[PDB]
Amino acid sequence: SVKISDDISITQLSDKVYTYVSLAMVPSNGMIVINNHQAALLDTPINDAQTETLVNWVADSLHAKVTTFIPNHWHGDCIGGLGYLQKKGVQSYANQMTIDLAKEKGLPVPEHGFTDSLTVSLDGMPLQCYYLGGGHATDNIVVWLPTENILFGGCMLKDNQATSIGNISDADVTAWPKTLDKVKAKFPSARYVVPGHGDYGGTELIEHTKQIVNQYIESTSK
């Protein structure tokens, strides 16, 4: 990874897909997808400033203008810099459930809402968004890049070194493992599998995570 400003670093997984780690002392993940000098931002850092720096480096260093935004769910490590994006005039798409929780919380609201699946065309490149059930957040979705075989699973996925379930204040714990099943069943050809925090890996993150969730369900039923 390439270090940059505001506790932010970035790694390129392909010609068109980059994943970033934004530190706020917790590190959170997101993606930068680029096609024709246009970019999609999947999750924002925790606040506008980190988001501004990221959006600037994508222009400056990547020569791509951020025109699209898709959040994983309503948390700050997904929509924390949305306010600023909206000031940049960025178009956004989110699970309708994310939009409603965001309205109700007086949080920046994503623009267009879908309920099951959505395929956003970034000037031609497809960004497939799916809501497959509650997990880490009752509203969590996953974004799939069919052309790249890259899945950004978001916070419902843990990295290979994680051992804990984390914040379950907004989780649907018992749905979490069934949703991970649908994901494994749905994207068996994923080359890279990016989690909400930590290192990206492959589809093995789905099972490892399911293990943690099941261990949690097992531990609180004794």
State yes or no: 73 annotated in a binding site: yes
Any catalytic annotation for residue 197? yes
Contact criterion met (CB below 8 Å) for 130 and 146 = no
Query: Cβ of residue 154: shortest distance to Na ion, in angstroms?
Result: 7
Read off the tokens for 143.
């974004």
Give first-to-last CA distance, the chain, whole Å: 43
Any catalytic annotation for residue 136? yes
Q: Which of 19, 28, 51, 53 binds Na ion (CB under 5 A)?
A: 28
Nearer to Na ion, 77 or 148 (CB): 77
Please return the burial class of 13, using the count of CB atoms within 10 Å of its CB with bins 0-12, 13-18 and 19+. Answer: middle
Residue 30: which of 168, 190, 194 has the closest Cα? 194
Any catalytic annotation for residue 65? no
Query: What SS3 state is found at 17?
Result: strand
Dump strand ranges (E) for 117-204.
Answer: 117-122, 125-130, 142-145, 150-154, 192-195
Q: Which of 19, 34, 35, 43 binds Na ion (CB under 5 A)?
A: 43
Query: Cβ of residue 37: shortest distance to Na ion, in angstroms?
Result: 24
Query: Cβ of residue 29: shortest distance to Na ion, in angstroms?
Result: 5
State yes or no: 167 annotated in a binding site: yes
Any catalytic annotation for residue 139? no
Give the range of 5-13, 41-49, 139-147, 176-184 binding Na ion by CB under 5 A. Answer: 41-49
State yes or no: 112 annotated in a binding site: no
- From 16, 35, 48, 155, the catalytic residue: 155
Q: Which helix (H) or strand (E) holds 50?
A: helix 48-60
User: Please, which of residues 69-108 interact with Na ion by CB under 5 A?
Assistant: 77
At residue 57, what is the residue type?
W
* Distance (Å, whole) CA 102 – CA 57: 27
State yes or no: 136 annotated in a binding site: yes
- From 136, 159, 172, 208, the catalytic residue: 136
Q: Which residues are annotated as a binding site for substrate?
A: 158, 167
- In the complex, which residues of this chain contact Na ion (CB under 5 A)? 28, 30, 43, 77
